[PDB]
Motif scaffolding. Structure first.
Motif, PDB file in Angstrom:
ATOM      1  N   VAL A  72      29.847  21.628  66.278  1.00  0.00           N
ATOM      2  CA  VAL A  72      29.905  20.921  65.003  1.00  0.00           C
ATOM      3  C   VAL A  72      29.100  19.628  65.063  1.00  0.00           C
ATOM      4  N   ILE A  73      29.083  18.967  66.222  1.00  0.00           N
ATOM      5  CA  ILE A  73      28.285  17.754  66.370  1.00  0.00           C
ATOM      6  C   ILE A  73      26.794  18.084  66.359  1.00  0.00           C
ATOM      7  N   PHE A  74      26.419  19.286  66.789  1.00  0.00           N
ATOM      8  CA  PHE A  74      25.014  19.649  66.888  1.00  0.00           C
ATOM      9  C   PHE A  74      24.534  20.561  65.766  1.00  0.00           C
ATOM     10  N   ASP A  75      25.438  21.167  64.994  1.00  0.00           N
ATOM     11  CA  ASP A  75      25.022  21.828  63.764  1.00  0.00           C
ATOM     12  C   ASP A  75      24.744  20.830  62.654  1.00  0.00           C
ATOM     13  N   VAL A  76      25.414  19.683  62.682  1.00  0.00           N
ATOM     14  CA  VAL A  76      25.061  18.562  61.824  1.00  0.00           C
ATOM     15  C   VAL A  76      23.776  17.881  62.294  1.00  0.00           C
ATOM     16  N   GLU A  77      23.522  17.886  63.606  1.00  0.00           N
ATOM     17  CA  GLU A  77      22.258  17.387  64.142  1.00  0.00           C
ATOM     18  C   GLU A  77      21.073  18.184  63.617  1.00  0.00           C
ATOM     19  N   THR A  78      21.170  19.514  63.647  1.00  0.00           N
ATOM     20  CA  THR A  78      20.017  20.334  63.300  1.00  0.00           C
ATOM     21  C   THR A  78      19.772  20.358  61.794  1.00  0.00           C
ATOM     22  N   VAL A  79      20.824  20.201  60.983  1.00  0.00           N
ATOM     23  CA  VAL A  79      20.650  20.284  59.536  1.00  0.00           C
ATOM     24  C   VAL A  79      20.044  18.991  58.999  1.00  0.00           C
ATOM     25  N   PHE A  80      20.146  17.903  59.764  1.00  0.00           N
ATOM     26  CA  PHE A  80      19.456  16.675  59.402  1.00  0.00           C
ATOM     27  C   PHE A  80      17.985  16.721  59.785  1.00  0.00           C
ATOM     28  N   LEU A  81      17.612  17.616  60.694  1.00  0.00           N
ATOM     29  CA  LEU A  81      16.237  17.740  61.149  1.00  0.00           C
ATOM     30  C   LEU A  81      15.418  18.711  60.314  1.00  0.00           C
ATOM     31  N   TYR A  82      16.061  19.585  59.543  1.00  0.00           N
ATOM     32  CA  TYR A  82      15.344  20.509  58.666  1.00  0.00           C
ATOM     33  C   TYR A  82      14.593  19.835  57.512  1.00  0.00           C
ATOM     34  N   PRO A  83      15.120  18.816  56.811  1.00  0.00           N
ATOM     35  CA  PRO A  83      14.252  18.135  55.839  1.00  0.00           C
ATOM     36  C   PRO A  83      13.179  17.282  56.484  1.00  0.00           C
ATOM     37  N   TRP A  84      13.398  16.807  57.709  1.00  0.00           N
ATOM     38  CA  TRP A  84      12.367  16.035  58.392  1.00  0.00           C
ATOM     39  C   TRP A  84      11.233  16.935  58.866  1.00  0.00           C
ATOM     40  N   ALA A  85      11.556  18.157  59.288  1.00  0.00           N
ATOM     41  CA  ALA A  85      10.533  19.043  59.834  1.00  0.00           C
ATOM     42  C   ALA A  85       9.667  19.645  58.736  1.00  0.00           C
TER      43      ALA A  85
END
Lengths: 100, 335, 235, 99, 483, 101, 44, 191, 66
Positions: free
Chosen positions: A51-64
């Motif tokens: 859960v700590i890292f699924d929130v990590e990756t979903v914040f990186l999708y608009p940046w990528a």
């Protein structure tokens, strides 16, 4: 108004693939004739770091997606987000959270 | 009643891609063991995926003794309709497209996260000790191999400047084979290929009970039509994962000019009517043919690596595949 | 239903037991990841062999014996015919003695190859399981030529020697087999000694000392794998 | 028929057809692997004789009956402790004196 | 434009150094990682003084203001964690839990609280309120095996995650009552009609704003958490997480609702006349020492709301001066609760009796901080209450200051009850420490930070009313930037 | 489908989670009802962003951060459930009332 | 660090590269198998 | 054309409130958690109709795939075979909660209907994955960096509140008076 | 989608000539020819599936000249 283009086929394909099991289980329906789990906190701890890292990756999708449309200032700012949560991964290894 | 022809013609390709993979599973694994595979049925086993699936329709799908009836039946349905729905993403063909969604390599990685819930209502609802233990083991394995799988899609999202799978194969069509993302992302291909194989294949899985950590895993008490979703839906997940290897890293519907000699994996004549139908149909389903190579590579990789235990599976997605997926996202960027 | 408690969980390995070494049933209890106790339930293949022999002659019991160690076969017929021939003082001819050495050493290869295939699949790599049984099928036809059966039910050992001599193209067919199988013995060794993932599942896993091996009562490649050097063909 | 243990054995059920219904019998001790594939072929000829409207006899009939007994219930013999049983840690008294 | 968040980003860096040192050194870092966070908090305090001269810019695209009001409350929350770390250097080091893992969650509540004071977006208000609230549930159940801290971490969760959802539904309505406009200055320009939708959006946000400051219809978590939590966390949520709710309420109810103003000044009077009564009459019937200071923080909250409902330039100056001297009264009283709970167990009233001959520095610290909490001269809490009733009398509000004075005498009786069982009981009337007090050393681990957090707090409690005139000018400059 | 039918759906989802907050006796069903509240404020928010000021979607950014906090409010929240369960061997909200008065 | 995951990955991803090659060379050999009802094997 | 976006709304608007009644009113707790994903997937289907295709996929990734799995892992750890069925424990205090829940709904339906919403007739979502990433680094930048410190704290604290005390459980480190390990020094007593 | 022009050229007439090739050279084919032989199965598989019960790969009877 609905200015999203491409979702005209998404409603029918949601119904047709839902009609794949509910009709095949019906097409099969006309052709056919000491209890303990030990409390080990590793199912919860392995899901905790998810859960700590699924929130990590979903914040990186608009940046990528918008990466070459932002600049170098928004790349250092996105790096502070990752480098803080890199220490979150180091904390999970050393504290034996994901040891199983 | 199946009124869109782009939805019907894709679905015929979407089911014959699975029946290739069940045929290719029983024949490539027979070639690596120097046995035949299924002979005597069809010509050479062509009806063996059909025969294995049709027998599960005709069997008495009985429930276990004291089980939750609604969670047992919806058990395999949470696993497989998220991998039946995301066949709306896969773009085979230049003039063939079903839906031009603004994302879809992110919608696929979102839809694949409902599958750990179906492994939790298959382990719980079967109501025995060894399947609930296999339910928590199978769920915590697909949990572990998704953040490496989502970060490999993040690598091909920076180079494509979007999550549109029509735009992703459009960045690999300017040079045919030199512009493929496997040549630009040699590490993130391996982060994708190991993490996707740890959620659909047979090698990193405890569902065969050769180690006897459980009775037979979470799919122990499932039989007949409910097991047909567990059996003929794990090859749906194998083809779907291999379809996206042949879209992200390898260029979907991307191939050089076919004006070549007889050694171009083709016939003997240069202007052949058999090659005018092997060019038009290949212009309809090309990345399926590319996905048949990684389906073949998934069967070939099963008989190479050891059947690794669950303690070293979860110490690979978190301790290895996640930091190599983080540094690949930085190396895809400038840094 | 199934509840989640805090006491150590006992799991039953079950008499079903989809493996190639018989039918055990281990009531092994777990402590999360480590085991703390295990009782083996045996007797699921107790056909009463000792009560049978009290109503059998020796030639009527020679077919019965190659079912205890049915991986071996004629190792069971070795002990059987040696019990009255070493008691009545019946002399065995020298040629029939060397055929017994030829048959028993081929059984130990087939004993170890049936051990090896399931062991390599339990420790990891499953692809040698189909290539090891092919090598055991060559040993089957060496017994199928000389005796009348593949690996067991081969009434070859007798009280005054052996049942019959070898076939005509037999001695030249180990020289085809055991000059081809011996290159593959080192191939099986380099599976576990090389690829250092298998050694992290076998180093220190199930270690028994030398002093506890003689006391608990062990023989063959489990006693000798603790540093004992006790072999009854030498002793 | 419980073949070689059909003469005198105190615990062998003589034939699996004393417990479950059998389709194809296969003699041999042991049968050749070619001989099992005949029994698969003999089985395959029996599946094709099965009719789709005769799918009703495949389910078990339930002629339940009930009687009340007065047998004393016994605690189970095989409990799940082998090493941690309170007889393996030390030899008992009135026996270690003569050791 | 990231030079205005420098007092918070110095605390971000030292949050990570005390985290990695727990991973690198492994409990050998607990000898130095508290003192690195002290100079990390001191270096974050000392960089607010160059920011005091700056002319109040609004950085980060209009989502963060760096005014004098945002810098005053940033120093109050940074001093709250500075006083907490001097306490918990021995407290959670005696429970056996990790010291570096405690001060990481303690510093996320600090930077989460410090970002509340200057936030202007509806999202950055909620994000910084979350990481203050999420960090504080982990701190009230940090001991994790008590069945009292675990019971207090639960009640604070199912009310804290509930009241932050009532706060979100009023914050989401403010996004919808305007045409977008997540920023609070852009909210006031769009909505001024005082409709029923603005009323429900006002009630929903002061169900979470007045949940951090513990007014009586939303105070129910406070007396149950404050006796189950570790006492430094009890010391932190009474001046750090309480002033952060007061840092929000000035930045929110004056920027988002300057049209609707006679309504929340009518609700917060009800929140004041209830928390002055029920804060001070129910603290009479308390036996635990941490529970008497629990209803005190509800009662002292109603004194701060006296200056909040009058809405004058001296009214908002009265609640900022009272919150400044409130840090010198709670963190000096809670120091003596900890320093008595470390020498002997069971820190409750009618066990402090027979003191002042065995621990005279504890009784001089605990009396002068509890007597000042009652507001007796010439201590700091007397002058803090004087300025609340001077600003209360200045613009109406004659019944609030009369209730503020009548409940200040009921406040005296339970504070003097603790001074009764410290100095007036004979040495034949002690229950604990009847020749059982451990003969204080100030040489063990963390007792010397515990002593200097007591000496420099009672000095800041005895002399902050006599020397209040620099503090009266430091506070009154933080009010001109309040609408 | 108008804006009004979305907010009534979000207001009804709010009061179902409100009813689950006060009537639930298992401590995990209270946390599941908190997620009903935090999805009520997200369903209210995207409807406020789809119909009001949809060019620069500021509600969908704000709807992201509520999903992230509730992901961290449940991970922190379930570690609190597992902390009580190790000491008090039930999960029963009518049994944690020992800090009463 | 980042200079290790390009060197801790090579040590086994090439060992499976020399393992995918030998298994593909297992398919090079003729299938030594006795198809039963059309090639019954002669008994001894 | 237009009615097919409306009949799929009420089919999803009834799918969320039926599943939300399933997580609250059902007697079985595991049935509540599997129906909790029925709440979250239906809301994720409602975001696609509301032109929020990113936050729709951001809900299946987190609420369905991460939070609901974390809920389900933390319900199969608490079964204990003990419900104890004490329905009327103290009084009928489950009827006082039905008053306030229907009262807040009667409040908000009065509020939602009578409020004039200034909805804009502009074309929405111009490829709304880039306008949400331009927002993470221009306007919503300081919420974006504080979310990492919130997640790092949520990984620090939820590990130390849920890990097994297998390092040193009988650990009397020191003492001025006797204090148990991993417990607050204020010992419980009766006055 | 054509009706009977190019659909029958892929579903009907070309799987019959692969089945002439698959029956003749499947076991005698080399290591390079079998890799192309596996490609003709997976590519013509929707056509190979229809004319599956109309071709048999069973070997011819022997002569027994001894």
């Amino acid at each position: 108004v609905f200015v999203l283009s491409g979702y005209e086929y998404f409603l029918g394909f949601l119904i047709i693939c839902s009609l794949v099991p509910v009709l095949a289980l019906a097409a099969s329906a006309l052709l056919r004739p000491g209890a303990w789990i030990q409390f080990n906190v590793r199912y919860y701890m392995f899901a905790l770091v998810f859960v700590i890292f699924d929130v990590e990756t979903v914040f990186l999708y608009p940046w990528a997606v918008a990466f070459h449309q932002l600049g170098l200032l928004a790349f250092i700012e996105a790096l502070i987000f990752i480098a803080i949560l890199v220490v979150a991964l180091v904390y999970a290894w050393r504290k034996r959270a994901l040891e199983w | 009643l199946w009124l869109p022809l782009p939805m019907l013609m894709m679905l015929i390709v979407a089911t014959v891609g699975v029946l290739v993979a069940v045929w290719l599973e029983r024949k490539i694994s027979a070639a690596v063991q120097q046995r035949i595979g299924p002979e005597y049925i069809g010509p050479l086993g062509i009806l063996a995926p059909l025969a294995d699936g049709l027998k599960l329709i005709f069997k008495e799908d009985v429930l276990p003794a004291n089980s939750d009836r609604w969670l047992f039946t919806l058990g395999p349905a949470v696993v497989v309709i998220p991998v039946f729905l995301s066949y709306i993403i896969v773009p085979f063909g230049q003039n063939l497209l079903i839906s031009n969604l603004a994302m879809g390599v992110f919608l696929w990685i979102a839809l694949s996260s409902i599958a750990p819930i179906g492994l939790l209502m298959a382990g719980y609802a079967s109501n025995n000790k060894y399947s609930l233990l296999g339910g928590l083991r199978a769920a915590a394995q697909s949990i572990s191999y998704e953040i490496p799988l989502a970060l490999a899609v993040l690598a091909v999202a920076m180079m494509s400047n979007g999550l549109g799978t029509v735009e992703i194969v459009e960045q690999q069509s300017q040079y045919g084979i030199l512009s493929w993302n496997v040549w630009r992302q040699p590490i993130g291909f391996l982060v994708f290929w190991i993490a996707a194989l740890a959620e659909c294949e047979r090698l990193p899985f405890d569902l065969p009970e050769a180690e006897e950590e459980l009775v037979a895993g979470y799919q122990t008490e499932y039989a007949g039509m409910k097991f047909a979703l567990f059996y003929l839906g794990a090859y749906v997940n194998l083809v779907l994962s291999a379809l996206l290897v042949s879209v992200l890293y390898f260029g979907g519907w991307s191939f050089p000019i076919p004006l070549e000699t007889i050694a171009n994996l083709l016939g003997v004549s240069e202007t052949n009517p058999f090659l005018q139908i092997a060019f038009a149909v290949l212009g309809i389903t090309m990345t399926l043919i590319k996905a048949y190579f990684f389906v073949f590579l998934a069967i070939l990789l099963r008989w190479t690596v050891p059947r690794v235990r669950i303690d070293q599976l979860l110490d690979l997605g978190w301790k290895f595949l996640l930091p190599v997926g983080l540094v690949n996202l930085l190396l895809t960027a400038g840094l | 239903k199934i509840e989640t408690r805090t006491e150590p969980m006992v799991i039953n390995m079950g008499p079903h037991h989809p493996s190639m070494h018989g039918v055990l049933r281990l009531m092994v209890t777990l402590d999360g990841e480590d085991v703390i106790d295990c009782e083996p339930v045996i007797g699921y293949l107790h056909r009463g062999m000792e009560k049978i022999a009290e109503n059998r002659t020796n030639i009527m019991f020679i077919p019965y014996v190659s079912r205890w160690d049915y991986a071996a076969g004629m190792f069971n017929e070795a002990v059987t015919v040696n019990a009255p021939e070493k008691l009545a003082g019946i002399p065995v001819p020298k040629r029939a003695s060397y055929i017994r050495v030829i048959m028993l050493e081929l059984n130990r290869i087939a004993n170890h190859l049936l051990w090896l295939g399931p062991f390599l699949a339990d420790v990891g790599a499953q692809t040698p399981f189909f290539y090891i049984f092919r090598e055991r099928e060559y040993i089957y036809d060496l017994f199928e030529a000389a005796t009348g059966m593949r690996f067991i039910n081969n009434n070859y050992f007798r009280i005054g020697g052996v049942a019959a001599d070898l076939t005509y193209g037999w001695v030249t067919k180990c020289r085809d087999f055991c000059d081809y199988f011996l290159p593959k013995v080192d191939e099986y060794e380099r599976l576990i000694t090389n690829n250092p993932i298998f050694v992290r599942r076998l180093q220190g896993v199930g270690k028994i000392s030398r002093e506890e091996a003689i006391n608990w009562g062990l023989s063959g490649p489990m006693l000798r794998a603790s540093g004992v050097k006790w072999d009854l063909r030498k002793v | 028929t419980g073949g070689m243990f059909s003469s005198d054995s105190y615990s062998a059920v003589r034939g699996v057809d004393k417990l479950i219904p059998v389709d194809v019998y296969l003699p041999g001790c042991p049968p050749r692997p070619e001989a099992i594939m005949d029994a698969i072929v003999k089985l395959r000829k029996k599946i094709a004789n099965e009719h789709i409207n005769e799918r009703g006899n495949l389910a078990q009939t339930h002629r339940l009956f009930t009687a009340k007994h007065k047998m004393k219930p016994v605690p189970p013999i095989l409990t799940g402790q082998y090493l941690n049983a309170p007889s393996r840690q030390a030899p008992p008294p009135a026996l270690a004196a003569a050791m | 434009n990231a030079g205005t968040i420098l007092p918070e980003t110095i605390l971000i860096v030292t949050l990570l150094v005390v985290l990695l040192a727990d991973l690198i050194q492994g409990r050998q870092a607990d000898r130095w990682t508290p003192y690195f966070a002290i100079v990390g908090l001191g270096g974050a305090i000392a960089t607010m003084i160059p920011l005091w001269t700056q002319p109040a810019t609004i950085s980060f695209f209009g989502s963060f203001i760096s005014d004098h009001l945002s810098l005053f409350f940033r120093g109050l929350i940074a001093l709250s964690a500075l006083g907490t770390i001097l306490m918990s250097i021995r407290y959670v080091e005696q429970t056996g839990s990790s010291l570096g893992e405690f001060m990481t969650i303690l510093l996320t509540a600090t930077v989460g609280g410090m970002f509340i004071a200057g936030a202007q977006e509806l999202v950055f208000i909620f994000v910084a309120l979350e990481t203050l609230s999420i960090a504080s549930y982990l701190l009230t159940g940090y001991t994790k095996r008590d069945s009292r801290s675990n019971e207090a971490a639960l009640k604070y969760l199912l009310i804290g995650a509930a009241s932050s959802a009532i706060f979100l539904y009023g914050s989401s309505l403010l996004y919808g009552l305007s045409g977008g406009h997540t920023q609070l200055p852009a909210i006031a320009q769009a909505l001024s009609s005082e409709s029923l939708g603005l009323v429900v959006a006002l009630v929903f946000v002061i169900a979470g704003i007045s949940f951090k400051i513990s007014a009586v219809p939303f105070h129910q978590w406070t007396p149950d958490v404050y006796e189950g939590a570790p006492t430094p966390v009890v010391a932190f949520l009474s001046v750090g997480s309480k002033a952060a709710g007061f840092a929000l309420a000035i930045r929110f109810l004056t920027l988002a609702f300057p049209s609707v103003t006679d309504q929340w000044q009518l609700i917060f009077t009800v929140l004041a006349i209830l928390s002055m009564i029920l804060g001070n009459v129910v603290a009479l019937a308390q036996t635990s020492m941490k529970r008497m200071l629990a209803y005190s923080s509800i009662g002292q909250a109603g004194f701060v709301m006296i200056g909040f409902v009058v809405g004058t330039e001296a009214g908002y100056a009265s609640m900022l001066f009272y919150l400044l001297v409130y840090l010198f009264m709670n963190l000096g009283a809670f120091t003596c609760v900890i320093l008595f709970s470390l020498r002997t167990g069971t820190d409750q009233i009618s066990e402090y009796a027979g003191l002042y001959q065995k621990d005279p520095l504890l009784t001089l610290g605990l009396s002068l901080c509890l007597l000042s909490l009652g507001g007796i001269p010439p201590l700091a809490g007397f002058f803090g209450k004087i300025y609340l009733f001077w600003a209360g009398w200045q613009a109406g509000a004659y019944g609030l200051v009369l209730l503020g004075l009548l409940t200040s005498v009921i406040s005296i009786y339970y504070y003097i009850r603790v001074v009764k069982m410290m100095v007036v009981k004979e040495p034949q009337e002690m229950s604990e420490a009847v020749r059982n007090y451990p003969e204080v050393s100030w040489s063990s681990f963390g007792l010397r930070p515990l002593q200097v957090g007591l000496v420099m707090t009672v000095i800041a409690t005895s002399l902050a009313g006599i020397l209040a005139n620099p503090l009266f000018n430091l506070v009154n400059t933080a009010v001109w930037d309040v609408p | 489908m108008q804006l009004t039918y979305v907010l009534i759906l979000a207001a009804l989802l709010f009061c179902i989670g409100i009813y689950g907050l006060v009537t639930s006796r298992n401590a995990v069903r209270v946390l599941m009802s908190i997620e009903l509240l935090l999805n009520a404020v997200n369903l209210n928010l995207i409807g406020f962003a789809n119909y009001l000021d949809g060019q620069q979607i500021k509600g969908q950014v704000f709807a992201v951060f509520v999903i992230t906090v509730a992901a961290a409010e449940a991970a922190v929240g379930l570690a609190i459930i597992l902390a009580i369960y190790r000491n008090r061997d039930t999960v029963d909200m009518e049994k944690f009332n020992l800090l009463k008065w | 660090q980042i200079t290790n995951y390009a060197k801790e990955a090579v040590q086994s991803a090439k060992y499976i590269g020399q393992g995918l090659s030998v298994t593909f060379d297992h398919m090079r050999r003729r299938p030594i198998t006795v198809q039963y009802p059309y090639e019954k094997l002669i008994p001894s | 054309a237009t009615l097919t976006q409306t009949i799929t709304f009420f089919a999803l608007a009834a799918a969320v409130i039926i599943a939300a009644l399933g997580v609250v009113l059902l007697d079985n707790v595991v049935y509540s958690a599997f129906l909790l994903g029925g709440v979250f997937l239906s809301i994720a289907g409602l975001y696609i109709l509301m032109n929020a295709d990113f936050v729709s996929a951001a809900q299946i990734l987190i609420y369905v795939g991460a939070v609901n799995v974390l809920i389900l892992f933390a319900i199969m750890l608490v079964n204990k075979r003990e419900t104890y069925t004490p329905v009327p424990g103290r009084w009928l205090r489950q009827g006082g909660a039905a008053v306030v829940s229907l009262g807040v709904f009667a409040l908000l339906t009065k509020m939602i209907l009578q409020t004039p919403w200034q909805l804009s007739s502009v074309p929405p979502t111009p490829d709304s994955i880039t306008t949400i990433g331009q927002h993470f680094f221009s306007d919503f930048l300081l919420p974006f960096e504080l979310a990492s410190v919130l997640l790092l704290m949520a990984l620090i604290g939820a590990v130390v509140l849920a890990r097994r005390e297998l390092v040193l459980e009988p650990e009397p480190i020191l003492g001025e008076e006797v204090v148990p390990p991993l417990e607050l020094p204020e010992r419980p007593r009766e006055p | 989608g054509v009706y009977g022009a190019l659909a029958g050229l892929y579903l009907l007439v070309v799987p019959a000539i692969v089945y002439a090739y698959l029956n003749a050279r499947w076991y005698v084919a080399s290591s390079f020819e079998r890799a192309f032989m596996y490609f003709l199965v997976t590519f013509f598989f929707p056509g190979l599936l229809l004319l599956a019960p109309f071709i048999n790969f069973r070997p011819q009877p022997r002569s027994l000249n001894s």
